Amino acid sequence: GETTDGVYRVMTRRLLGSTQVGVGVMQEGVFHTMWHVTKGAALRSGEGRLDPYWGDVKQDLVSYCGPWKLDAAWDGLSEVQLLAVPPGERAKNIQTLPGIFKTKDGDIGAVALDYPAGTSGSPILDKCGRVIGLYGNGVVIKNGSYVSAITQGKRE
Amino acid sequence: DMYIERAGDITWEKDAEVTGNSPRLDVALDESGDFSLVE
Ligand SMILES: Cc1cc(N)c2ccc(Cl)c(Cl)c2n1
């Protein structure tokens, strides 16, 4: 059905009413979201059907209709914008300077912003508007606040 | 069954709300995709 580029909400009817479970990015005919949002399940786009194509629980990512397309990366210096799409609220750009998740396998950018769990899959953008990663997989720090990683996939 | 609904264009917006800090956190990623703090 709808295959236009942009940001989309991932919804469900299994729970009470229409509950938003996550967010995703349509780009080049491919839907990109986080694995924990859909659990690899097929999606509906109006009358059409989005079937998974690639997924990985470790990376917490999943693409529908084709391979992962988003290949931009945080430069490690510039401020970024979280295009937050919160449950029952309008899309809203929030500018921040990312922190760092230091891991044994390398450093990853991290965004210190606290939004409902149903916001997971919201894209993070560079100054060109290119998607550098997805929000929604991270850790809870000492003060109770949430810090998500900038999660990006690998384009072939 | 899950479904998708459009929420907007992907553009950088000038004069957006600038908020949030930049912490440096030592973390561990497990086989299930869960991050944990290594403090
Ligand atoms: C405790 C907490 C607080 C949040 N804002 C949050 C946002 C996204 C996701 Cl995926 C999770 Cl698990 C979250 N958990």
Curated annotation (Swiss-Prot), chain A:
Topological relation to the membrane, as annotated: Peripheral membrane protein
Peptidase S7 domain residues: 1-156
Protein location: Host cytoplasm; Host endoplasmic reticulum membrane
PTMs per UniProt: Acetylated by host KAT5. Acetylation modulates NS3 RNA-binding and unwinding activities and plays an important positive role for viral replication.
Top-rank lineage group of the source organism: Viruses
Active site: H36, D60, S120
Known function: Displays three enzymatic activities: serine protease, NTPase and RNA helicase. NS3 serine protease, in association with NS2B, performs its autocleavage and cleaves the polyprotein at dibasic sites in the cytoplasm: C-prM, NS2A-NS2B, NS2B-NS3, NS3-NS4A, NS4A-2K and NS4B-NS5. NS3 RNA helicase binds RNA and unwinds dsRNA in the 3' to 5' direction. Leads to translation arrest when expressed ex vivo. Disrupts host centrosome organization in a CEP63-dependent manner to degrade host TBK1 and inhibits innate immune response. Inhibits the integrated stress response (ISR) in the infected cell.
Subunit architecture: Forms a heterodimer with NS2B. Interacts with NS4B. Interacts with unphosphorylated RNA-directed RNA polymerase NS5; this interaction stimulates RNA-directed RNA polymerase NS5 guanylyltransferase activity. Interacts with non-structural protein 2A. Interacts with host SHFL; this interaction promotes NS3 degradation via a lysosome-dependent pathway. Interacts with host CEP63; this interaction disorganizes the centrosome and inhibits host innate immune response.
Protein name: Serine protease NS3
Lineage: Viruses, Riboviria, Orthornavirae, Kitrinoviricota, Flasuviricetes
